[PDB]
Write a protein that binds this ligand. Sequence first.
Ligand SMILES: *[C@@H]1O[C@H](CO)[C@@H](O[C@@H]2O[C@H](CO)[C@@H](O)[C@H](O)[C@H]2NC(C)=O)[C@H](O)[C@H]1NC(C)=O
Ligand SMILES: *[C@@H]1O[C@H](CO)[C@@H](O[C@@H]2O[C@H](CO)[C@@H](O)[C@H](O)[C@H]2NC(C)=O)[C@H](O)[C@H]1NC(C)=O
Ligand SMILES: *[C@@H]1O[C@H](CO)[C@@H](O[C@@H]2O[C@H](CO)[C@@H](O)[C@H](O)[C@H]2NC(C)=O)[C@H](O)[C@H]1NC(C)=O
Ligand SMILES: *[C@@H]1O[C@H](CO)[C@@H](O[C@@H]2O[C@H](CO)[C@@H](O)[C@H](O)[C@H]2NC(C)=O)[C@H](O)[C@H]1NC(C)=O
Ligand SMILES: *[C@@H]1O[C@H](CO)[C@@H](O[C@@H]2O[C@H](CO)[C@@H](O)[C@H](O)[C@H]2NC(C)=O)[C@H](O)[C@H]1NC(C)=O
Ligand SMILES: *[C@@H]1O[C@H](CO)[C@@H](O)[C@H](O)[C@H]1NC(C)=O
Ligand SMILES: *[C@@H]1O[C@H](CO)[C@@H](O)[C@H](O)[C@H]1NC(C)=O
Ligand SMILES: *[C@@H]1O[C@H](CO)[C@@H](O)[C@H](O)[C@H]1NC(C)=O
Ligand SMILES: *[C@@H]1O[C@H](CO)[C@@H](O)[C@H](O)[C@H]1NC(C)=O
Ligand SMILES: *[C@@H]1O[C@H](CO)[C@@H](O)[C@H](O)[C@H]1NC(C)=O
Ligand SMILES: *[C@@H]1O[C@H](CO)[C@@H](O)[C@H](O)[C@H]1NC(C)=O
Ligand SMILES: *[C@@H]1O[C@H](CO)[C@@H](O)[C@H](O)[C@H]1NC(C)=O
Ligand SMILES: *[C@@H]1O[C@H](CO)[C@@H](O)[C@H](O)[C@H]1NC(C)=O
Ligand SMILES: *[C@@H]1O[C@H](CO)[C@@H](O)[C@H](O)[C@H]1NC(C)=O
Lengths: 226, 115, 229, 316
Amino acid sequence: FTRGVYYPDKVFRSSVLHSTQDLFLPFFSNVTWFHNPVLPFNDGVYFASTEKSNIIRGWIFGTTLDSKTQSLLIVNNATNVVIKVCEFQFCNDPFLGVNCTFEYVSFKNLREFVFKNIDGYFKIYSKHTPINLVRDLPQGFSALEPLVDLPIGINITRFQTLLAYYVGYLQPRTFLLKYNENGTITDAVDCALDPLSETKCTLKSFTVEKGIYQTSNFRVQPTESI
Amino acid sequence: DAVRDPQTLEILDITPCSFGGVSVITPGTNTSNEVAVLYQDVNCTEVNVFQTRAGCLIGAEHVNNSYECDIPIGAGICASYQTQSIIAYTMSLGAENSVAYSNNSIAIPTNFTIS
Amino acid sequence: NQKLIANQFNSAIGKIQDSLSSTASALGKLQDVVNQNAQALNTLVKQLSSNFGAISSVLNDILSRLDPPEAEVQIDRLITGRLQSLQTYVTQQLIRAAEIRASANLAATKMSECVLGQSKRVDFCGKGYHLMSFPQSAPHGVVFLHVTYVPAQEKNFTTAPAICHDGKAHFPREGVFVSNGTHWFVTQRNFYEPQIITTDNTFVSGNCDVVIGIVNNTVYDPLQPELDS
Amino acid sequence: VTTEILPVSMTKTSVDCTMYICGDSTECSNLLLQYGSFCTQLNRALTGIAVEQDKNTQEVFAQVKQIYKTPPIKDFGGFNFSQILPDPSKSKRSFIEDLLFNKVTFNGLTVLPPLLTDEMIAQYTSALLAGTITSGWTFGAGAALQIPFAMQMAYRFNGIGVTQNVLYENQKLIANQFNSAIGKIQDSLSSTASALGKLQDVVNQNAQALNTLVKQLSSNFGAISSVLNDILSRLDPPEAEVQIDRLITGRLQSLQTYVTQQLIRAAEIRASANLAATKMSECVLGQSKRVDFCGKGYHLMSFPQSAPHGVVFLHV
Ligand SMILES: *[C@@H]1O[C@H](CO)[C@@H](O[C@@H]2O[C@H](CO)[C@@H](O)[C@H](O)[C@H]2NC(C)=O)[C@H](O)[C@H]1NC(C)=O
Ligand SMILES: *[C@@H]1O[C@H](CO)[C@@H](O[C@@H]2O[C@H](CO)[C@@H](O)[C@H](O)[C@H]2NC(C)=O)[C@H](O)[C@H]1NC(C)=O
Ligand SMILES: *[C@@H]1O[C@H](CO)[C@@H](O[C@@H]2O[C@H](CO)[C@@H](O)[C@H](O)[C@H]2NC(C)=O)[C@H](O)[C@H]1NC(C)=O
Ligand SMILES: *[C@@H]1O[C@H](CO)[C@@H](O[C@@H]2O[C@H](CO)[C@@H](O)[C@H](O)[C@H]2NC(C)=O)[C@H](O)[C@H]1NC(C)=O
Ligand SMILES: *[C@@H]1O[C@H](CO)[C@@H](O[C@@H]2O[C@H](CO)[C@@H](O)[C@H](O)[C@H]2NC(C)=O)[C@H](O)[C@H]1NC(C)=O
Ligand SMILES: *[C@@H]1O[C@H](CO)[C@@H](O)[C@H](O)[C@H]1NC(C)=O
Ligand SMILES: *[C@@H]1O[C@H](CO)[C@@H](O)[C@H](O)[C@H]1NC(C)=O
Ligand SMILES: *[C@@H]1O[C@H](CO)[C@@H](O)[C@H](O)[C@H]1NC(C)=O
Ligand SMILES: *[C@@H]1O[C@H](CO)[C@@H](O)[C@H](O)[C@H]1NC(C)=O
Ligand SMILES: *[C@@H]1O[C@H](CO)[C@@H](O)[C@H](O)[C@H]1NC(C)=O
Ligand SMILES: *[C@@H]1O[C@H](CO)[C@@H](O)[C@H](O)[C@H]1NC(C)=O
Ligand SMILES: *[C@@H]1O[C@H](CO)[C@@H](O)[C@H](O)[C@H]1NC(C)=O
Ligand SMILES: *[C@@H]1O[C@H](CO)[C@@H](O)[C@H](O)[C@H]1NC(C)=O
Ligand SMILES: *[C@@H]1O[C@H](CO)[C@@H](O)[C@H](O)[C@H]1NC(C)=O
């Protein structure tokens, strides 16, 4: 739907429509729905989960994830969140029951997260909200604030989730973000979703007046190489 | 403009790939979020489709009835939103009104208004 | 018709108020000038954030980060871009100003000929026959209320270029001959007001063998009854 | 009868500033974006002009809310208007209009069509002409009120200080002089191509503006090559970007020059369109008392004719 938006930076803006390009989850895209597989990280991951009993505990991010090189282990065990970037040896199928360069220690609910790794920095954004829905993600809009920024310097190409949840992938698309008087994002336009969204982003307005507007340029693409 | 194929002694013309501006015809989001798209100066074979001189118009229904122009496209064609969908039509220039001319008849106003 | 005219005028003004109150776009021309000028400056300020090929859009970052022998080069790129931006802005303001100047000259012309006088220029002061106009102030501009006379209910009359009396051809001094099917009258061109055709309404020139479409009539002479009585 | 020609509109040229500067080049586009709105505002300036050109045409020709038509019987008192009235057997244009038309002639550069096509302008000039002939000035001020044509001329003569009996007494002479004068217009336009030089000049100036813009693509501007693809094929990014930057500055500068010239030229055409609209309103729909506004002599009437990129008036 329209989720997968986060505050691209730490700048307060109010009563303004701001156009920005960053890695966001494309609107109305498909997210893989899970009820511990290893998934690609690509350019960044949109992760969302729903809970009744705190089943999901954490994530592993890295390349080989087999005591060969560095990886990130982020786990919330009972009461304390633990983040480590050690060259960890993981189980064949890691689960939870009922060389280190960095260490830090701290359905009814929905927990959304954005994990992206740019220029050595692992950026984690998240949002918590109550829900009343078993079958799918709720339709609606919210933006995720940043919580953690780790100077890891570690290459991430794969990740896995440690225990329903959804996994999407971020893309370098332009969005028009609507900021209210209090500095929050209350709406957004995915500028490449359809021709009306393109018009809204071109005009930089969530509503547009009747008329004809030039918004883009059509180009026939090459199909072969000679 | 053209090249000689280095393996076969033949001359080939190079015609750059079709392109043009893209305009979106919007009834106004206060009434409808439905839009029609005009691909400027292109053939529809490269892009409820209407081919006009101004380009390839997609999503608007062509209507034979003439109407006063609302959202202009070009080359005599305008778009509008009517009972509902987006339509395209040849614009009307004005109401037809022949004058009852004769060599012995004059029309003289009997009343007036101030506007 | 003074009461009718005053009432039509008073009604028309009330209509102006409703039109202006209902649709803001009525003054779109003035809003457009404001929008273009505001956009010109938003564009100008936004350009300060562009790199223009420089390492950074921020002048202070270049100066504090790079040694002067290199910093000067990065600055020259920002100066060229920012100087070029002002040149673009100023050129646009001068051209836009020419448009506004032309509008102002037109507005001044209309006030002098339309408000201070009574223009005879067609569609200069709105559709209809111009009577008078009133200026109103407005943001960055002027609004005129043009009061015009517009013909309204009309009738089909039979006409003739002249009439035959004693073989003499009589033409209206200031009007047109009309017929209601049985009687001929002379009436002012822009308002039906039939009068008896008399020697005081018409003048004589030439005769019935010359004028094409001339018809037979009787022209009344106000003097003869007086001579007889 | 004299002929006066006024340009009304320009060719609606629209330029894709990104394709013009960085045609099919990702590396060039990424550098072009470093210039912010310099590219986008040029696309905007040209779009604004294209819109203005349709506005100009409408202000000049769409001065009538109804399409008036003449009767099948041309009983206009001996005045022969068949040379200026539309020919239904053909494009619904008059003989003179056809003469007027016949005398005027992949770099991200495209041309948009006008909203009103030639046949639509012909319908507007036909309506204005039919109005002028059958109802004088009343179709302008109010309703089209029919009046015999000879009688209409009587009003036109009094309007210049000549008592209308002059018209009627000399009606055959006047109609013959009028008919002859129109025939002279046909011969003048057929023979002298330069008669419409004003319209041809607008076309020529715009053609030169575009030819200059395209030729500038061949310039090096200090770069090793004017061809963007050759720079990209020969050099790695650390240097290719320098050579590209030189081309971007030159090509961006070229567009700015072009757009500025189009805006200034457009102001000239707009002024002519405003004049043309003024003349049609005061000269065709009314009876101007302004000296030499509607040609030499005392003004009686005028008739509009369509033309490529403009309007031609026949002043009687
Ligand atoms: C000219 O038309 C006006 C209407 O526009 C006439 O005035 C109206 O007359 C009717 C009675 O027939 C009244 O009920 C209306 O209230 C009147 N309206 C106004 C604004 O006064 C007027 O009488 C007509 N004049 C002539 C000479 O026929
Ligand atoms: C043309 O106008 C004349 C003058 O008003 C009309 O003649 C009068 O008709 C009335 C009856 O409605 C008589 O009472 C008058 O005595 C008549 N006057 C004269 C001088 O004869 C005439 O009827 C009108 N004709 C038409 C066809 O409407
Ligand atoms: C106007 O009235 C005169 C008579 O006063 C008409 O004159 C007649 O013309 C015809 C045709 O040439 C002759 O045969 C008659 O002998 C003429 N009559 C007289 C008394 O001489 C004239 O034709 C009438 N015109 C119109 C337009 O009705
Ligand atoms: C108006 O003038 C045109 C000439 O420009 C007349 O058309 C000619 O009519 C004659 C017959 O009388 C034909 O033999 C010619 O071949 C026609 N010429 C053309 C070019 O068509 C027209 O008849 C005149 N109309 C009126 C009402 O006088
Ligand atoms: C006014 O001038 C016109 C010419 O412009 C005269 O009309 C011509 O008269 C001669 C005879 O002298 C004829 O051969 C021509 O054929 C006529 N031409 C036209 C177009 O009709 C007219 O007679 C002069 N009038 C006066 C009162 O002098
Ligand atoms: C969580 O795990 C860490 C080891 O990484 C341990 O030190 C800590 O005590 C554990 N906390 C809880 C609440 O079990
Ligand atoms: C830590 O890295 C060093 C190489 O710098 C390697 O020799 C050592 O075995 C590694 N230790 C572990 C526990 O992986
Ligand atoms: C990440 O991959 C790049 C090669 O693209 C390599 O140069 C860099 O050292 C790698 N980073 C780590 C932490 O291994
Ligand atoms: C901003 O927060 C206050 C509470 O401190 C709330 O009352 C107000 O409605 C909020 N404004 C908006 C635009 O949400
Ligand atoms: C147009 O906008 C107004 C608010 O300004 C709203 O009340 C009205 O319902 C809208 N029109 C339609 C067709 O929804
Ligand atoms: C557009 O394509 C059709 C084939 O579907 C062809 O017949 C027509 O001539 C083409 N028109 C142009 C302007 O290329
Ligand atoms: C318009 O009428 C023609 C018949 O003259 C018909 O072939 C065509 O399909 C009609 N178009 C529409 C949109 O009704
Ligand atoms: C005048 O006569 C014509 C028919 O030739 C008719 O259509 C028109 O309505 C009439 N006008 C009036 C005012 O009666
Ligand atoms: C008016 O037209 C009729 C019909 O053609 C004709 O008989 C009559 O003589 C004409 N009259 C004038 C003055 O032109």
